[PDB]
Design a protein around this nucleic acid. Structure first.
Ligand SMILES: Nc1nc2c(ncn2[C@@H]2O[C@H](COP(=O)(O)OP(=O)(O)CP(=O)(O)O)[C@@H](O)[C@H]2O)c(=O)[nH]1
Lengths: 133, 126, 37, 192, 23, 426, 136
RNA sequence: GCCCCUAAGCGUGUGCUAAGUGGAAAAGGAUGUGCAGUCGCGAAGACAACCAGGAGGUUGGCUUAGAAGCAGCCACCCUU
């Protein structure tokens, strides 16, 4: 059930995705077939994968996307950041897909509430200083 | 508790009773948001999944003056709206009585009067 | 136990209690069991 | 600035002395005197809880209409006698004042902003002598250090005064100076 | 030094009134 | 411990043997030591006597010469670069008429002020006290005019005179007795050291240590080679207790690096006795790091003196002396153009500067090389159902984790006996 | 430690401790104070230890004010000597404190660690104390 | 000084003490028990309780053995 924010330009090169193919009693590269047939055919702008195996050994995704903080990782620019909160700016983001900032996931951990976009404008953004201008 | 902010909010939430003619009443039983995000995001078109936790459905409805009922506090009671889109959000949440499976049918605000369960299903068809 | 004339809490999981005339600290982590005398 | 005189009562004191004043303060009273331009040396007896209720809310320069055997006289709190270790009130000067009179007091000043976060902000003297009308005496004049570089002196000219309030002390004494914040070497090398 | 303490803490009785000889 | 005032010192010393330069070298340490105790040094006279005098160390007339110099500079003290008996330092006091307190006494006293930990304090009092036992009649004021005696000895009957003993015995008994309590106390503190080092003992780890004389660095090399900031004062004897920190190279096994106290030439054979902490370490190590300064007139000297103390240690404990690396520092910032000489014939004369100038790159890479043999090597076939095979396989100290596959993982790494152990299933 | 440069009279009588402090009984420089509650012969090393115990807990910010100065010497007749032939040499340097007299003053932004550091200072002093502020 | 030794009160009215405190003691530690005001919530039934609520892009960074919500940490403008 392990999600991720590790890099998405992977073709089973490394301990993140290779063992993720090589776990839980499934085929060796059958998810690798669909993954490098579908996701990085769309050039691989960051795509996590949550393990939702059925009894028939399948699990499908959506067009998975970082939130409005690091939307630039998908769309515009460099693949880096900082480590402290409220730090220096690294890049900038325009306002084309700013109704698509909410078009990936609008969930909460608790049972509490909704509107993760009105959350994400300042929630998971001030932890680093990755910017939208 | 403080009745200032709470009363001036929820009295107008139940003053939208007086403007409208139809809101649907459901039950909240608590899940992930990740399974209720699809519910409120997709089939609540212009509607809500609001708690009104167990709070102010009968005391703060006196400005409507049409509060001829007792069971506004009895059990949990929700305030999902079908004023603009009547059958749409109503049956769109009633399909979650077979999809979400964390709610039942109660019945509620139809026409300002207290309708039976069988006939509120009959008008949710018709 | 670490018996000494000055017991006081250490972590955020331990309470103090007054039991059988002595005041003592009780914790889930058993390194922090203290009592006065 | 236009406030309202704090209504109070005060009976005139029969017997003065050290033992009589101690006996009065053992019952919840505060001794006081009401000198001034009216030439009323009036040996009174205020009440401690009501007097501290006026003082800790409406500032220390609190005008007091007070019922001295059936007459309401406006009086300004001139000076106090607080014990240094019990921190109660042991006396009260009540200068008799009438309206329209410009009178001099000493109000306390406070700060508003934070700083620039790399400096330390230090108060120097939190009292300012000002000349105001009797029913115009302000309280808690605000100074603003908001994004202010070090090497700054905020003297007693840059304070902003309300209506009708003139100054007494000269505009060359410091109020808030902002020095650059030290380090651990400057903490270990200052005081040995 | 129990003996000196017991001998000079005897002056705190009501019949001695705070004082005793040699204490 | 005694604390008064000086700051006025004239140093003296017999040049019984050694080269001229060698001779004034000693007097010089005495200057640095004197100032490390904080007192201005005025003049400094050295004689050439094939062997000291049993009454006044230097001579009779030379004492007279010193008498006038003490009246000239008014120096309130005189310090002798040698160990002197109670008698010699008492006669030379009526001569010059001022402090004639020897070197061993300067060092023993510097250790009193500069030392913090309680343990360190105890060991000091032993030393100072063992130095003062052999000086009681000399400090014979307690016996000065203790002629109040003449007690009758009719004996065989009432004397009621209690002393059933001479006053010197009774007094000697006290100092000797206190010394004995402290003695047992100090030997107990051994258990505290051992217990504070149980984790390191177990889980065998490597253990490099840094030997070397005082002012050679040591605590500069540690504050840089790993991390941490310990007292790095430019004075003498700045570390009076051992420290240990973690650090590693490719073999992350701790290369636990200890820093120790400094071995000056001619130890006072007193306070050092209890400075066993530094030596307990030398014994239990996998390497040693003799650091020597290039900014020194003759570096080779301290190399041998220090090495001697290491000699005695290996002798008592009957140990195969550990591999030792001598790293020269103060180079680069080398206030030394005599640099090449060492380089002509010196092992690992790294221009460690420790200050700016680094130089630590070669050492680090050549450090793990001399440490004791590793003992973990392995190549295996791990199934895809790992999640556990990582045991320490990747997550271990030196676990290599340096080979892979598609089938589980054809890991080809290294593993310790108690970690991945034998579990690995090829 | 804090020692005077020179003093007029080298051997002095013991400063009598009676009555309440009639000067110093307010916080004047800084924001938080340490007001004494008993009489003491607060010495040189206690003031040095309390200043160190404050500066260890405020690591980089704020001032610290030592309002008192030890300039009243106490003597000590030397070891194992009978009683007689002169007052001893001046050994200790002591400041005289009365109840009310504010000893240490501190300015610091963080109100929690200010009272923490001032309790750390209070625990090294030979009397009872308080943490008074510069307001009422 | 007044229960018996031991002359005279197991005196009267209202409270406190659980320590044989009374019938020795310090820095200091501390969910003892009466009193008196103060501060938000404040006999709305608030608070406690049985409890639906469990990996938001949550294997994020600082970085990649993974950094398996979670070695460590410099921020919680955040919401049916
Ligand atoms: N000029 C110069 N000095 C250096 C260099 N490296 C180290 N030092 C000197 O060495 C000193 C640091 O080593 P130090 O801590 O004195 O060694 P130590 O043996 O622990 C001192 P102690 O005798 O107390 O144990 C510094 O004072 C510094 O001046 C260098 O590259 N250049």
């Amino acid at each position: 059930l392990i999600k991720l924010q590790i890099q998405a330009g992977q073709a089973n090169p490394a301990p993140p995705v290779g063992p993720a193919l090589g776990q839980h009693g499934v085929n060796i590269m059958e998810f690798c077939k669909a993954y490098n047939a579908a996701t990085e055919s769309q050039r691989g702008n960051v795509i996590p994968v949550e393990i939702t195996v059925y009894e028939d050994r399948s699990f499908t995704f959506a067009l998975k996307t970082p939130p409005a903080a690091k939307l630039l990782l998908k769309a515009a620019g460099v693949q880096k950041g900082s480590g402290e909160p409220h730090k220096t700016k690294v890049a900038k983001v325009t306002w084309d897909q700013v109704r698509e900032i909410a078009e990936t996931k609008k969930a909460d951990l608790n049972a509490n509430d909704i509107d993760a976009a009105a959350k994400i404008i300042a929630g998971t953004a001030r932890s680093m200083g990755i910017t939208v201008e | 508790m403080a009745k200032a902010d709470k009363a001036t909010a929820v009295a107008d939430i139940a003053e939208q009773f007086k403007a409208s003619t139809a809101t649907v009443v459901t039950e909240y039983r608590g899940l992930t948001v990740a399974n209720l995000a699809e519910l409120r995001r997709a089939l609540g078109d212009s509607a809500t999944y609001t708690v009104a936790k167990n709070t102010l459905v009968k005391r703060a409805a006196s400005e409507a003056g049409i509060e001829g009922l007792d069971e506004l506090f009895a059990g949990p009671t929700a305030i999902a709206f079908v004023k603009g889109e009547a059958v749409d959000a109503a049956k769109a949440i009633k399909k979650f009585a077979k999809d979400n499976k964390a709610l039942v049918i109660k019945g509620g605000y139809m026409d300002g009067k207290a309708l039976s369960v069988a006939d509120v299903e009959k008008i949710a068809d018709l | 136990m670490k018996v000494n004339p000055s017991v006081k809490p250490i972590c955020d999981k331990c309470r103090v209690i007054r039991r059988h005339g002595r005041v003592m600290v009780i914790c889930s982590d058993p390194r922090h069991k203290q009592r006065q005398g | 600035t236009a406030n309202i005189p704090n209504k109070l009562t005060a009976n005139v004191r029969t017997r003065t002395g050290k033992g009589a004043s101690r006996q009065a303060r053992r019952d919840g009273k505060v001794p006081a005197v009401l000198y001034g331009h009216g030439t009323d040396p009036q040996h009174l007896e205020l009440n401690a809880r009501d007097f501290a209720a006026v003082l800790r809310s409406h500032g220390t320069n609190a005008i007091l209409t007070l019922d001295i055997e059936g007459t309401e006289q406006l009086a300004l709190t001139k000076a106090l006698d607080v014990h240094p270790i019990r921190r109660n009130i042991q006396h009260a000067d009540l200068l008799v004042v009438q309206r329209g009179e410009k009178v001099t007091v000493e109000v306390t000043v406070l700060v508003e902003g934070d700083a620039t976060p790399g400096t330390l902000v230090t108060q120097d003297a939190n009292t300012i002598e000002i000349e105001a009308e009797a029913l115009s005496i302000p309280e808690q004049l605000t100074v603003s250090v908001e994004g202010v570089e070090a090497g700054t002196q905020i003297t007693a000219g840059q304070i902003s005064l309300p209506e009708g309030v003139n100054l007494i002390s000269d505009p060359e004494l410091l109020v808030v100076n902002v020095v650059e914040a030290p380090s651990a070497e400057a903490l270990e090398e200052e005081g040995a | 030094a129990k003996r000196g303490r017991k001998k000079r803490d005897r002056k705190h009785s009501k019949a001695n009134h705070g004082k005793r000889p040699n204490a | 411990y005694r604390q008064l005032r000086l700051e006025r010192v004239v140093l003296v010393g017999v040049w019984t043997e050694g080269s001229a330069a060698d001779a004034e070298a000693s007097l010089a340490e005495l200057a640095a030591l004197a100032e490390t105790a904080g007192s201005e040094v005025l003049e400094g006279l050295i004689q050439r006597r094939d062997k000291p005098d049993p009454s006044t160390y230097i001579g009779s007339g030379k004492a007279a010469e010193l008498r006038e110099v003490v009246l000239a500079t008014g120096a309130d003290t005189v310090i002798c670069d040698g160990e002197l008996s109670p008698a010699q330092l008492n006669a030379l006091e009526k001569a010059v008429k001022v402090k004639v307190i020897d070197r061993t006494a300067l060092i023993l006293d510097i250790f009193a002020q500069h030392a913090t930990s309680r343990e360190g304090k105890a060991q000091v009092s032993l030393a100072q006290m063992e130095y003062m036992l052999p000086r009681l009649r000399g400090w014979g004021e307690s016996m000065s005019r203790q002629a109040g005696g003449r007690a009758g000895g009719a004996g065989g009957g009432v004397g009621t005179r209690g002393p059933g003993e001479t006053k010197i015995e009774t007094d000697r008994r006290r100092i000797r007795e206190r010394m004995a309590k402290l003695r047992r106390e100090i030997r107990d503190m051994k258990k505290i050291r051992d217990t504070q080092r149980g984790s390191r003992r177990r889980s065998e780890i490597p253990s490099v240590a840094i030997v070397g004389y005082t002012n050679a660095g040591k605590s500069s090399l540690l504050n840089a080679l790993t991390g941490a900031g310990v007292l790095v004062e430019n004075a003498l004897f700045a570390t009076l207790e051992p420290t240990t920190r973690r650090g590693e190279f490719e073999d992350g096994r701790p290369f636990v690096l200890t820093d120790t106290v400094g071995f000056v030439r001619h130890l006072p054979t007193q306070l050092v006795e209890a400075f066993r902490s530094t030596l307990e370490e030398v014994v239990d190590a996998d390497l040693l790091i003799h650091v020597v300064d290039g900014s020194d007139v003759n570096p080779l000297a301290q190399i041998n003196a220090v090495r001697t103390v290491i000699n005695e240690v290996v002798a008592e404990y009957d140990i195969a002396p550990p591999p030792e690396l001598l790293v020269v520092n103060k180079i680069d910032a080398a206030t030394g153009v005599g640099l090449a000489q060492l380089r002509r014939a010196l092992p690992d004369a790294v221009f460690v500067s420790a200050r700016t100038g680094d130089g630590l790159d070669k050492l680090r890479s050549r450090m793990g090389e001399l440490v004791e043999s590793t003992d973990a090597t392995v190549d295996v076939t791990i199934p895809y159902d790992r999640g556990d095979l990582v045991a320490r396989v990747h997550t271990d100290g030196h676990v290599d984790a340096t080979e892979h596959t598609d089938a589980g993982t054809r890991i080809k790494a290294r593993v310790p006996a108690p970690l991945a152990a034998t579990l690995r299933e090829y | 430690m804090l020692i005077p440069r020179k003093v007029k009279h080298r051997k002095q009588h013991h400063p009598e401790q009676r009555g309440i402090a009639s000067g110093g009984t307010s916080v004047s420089f800084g924001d938080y104070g340490i007001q004494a509650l008993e009489h003491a012969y607060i010495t040189n090393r206690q003031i040095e230890s309390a200043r160190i115990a404050i500066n260890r807990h405020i690591k980089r910010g704020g001032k610290v004010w030592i309002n008192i100065f030890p300039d009243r010497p106490l003597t000590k007749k030397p070891a194992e000597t009978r009683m007689g032939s002169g007052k001893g040499s001046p050994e200790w340097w002591v400041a005289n404190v009365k109840p009310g007299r504010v000893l240490f003053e501190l300015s610091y932004p963080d109100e929690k660690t200010a009272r923490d550091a001032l309790t750390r200072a209070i625990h090294k002093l030979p009397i009872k104390a308080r943490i008074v502020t510069r307001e009422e």
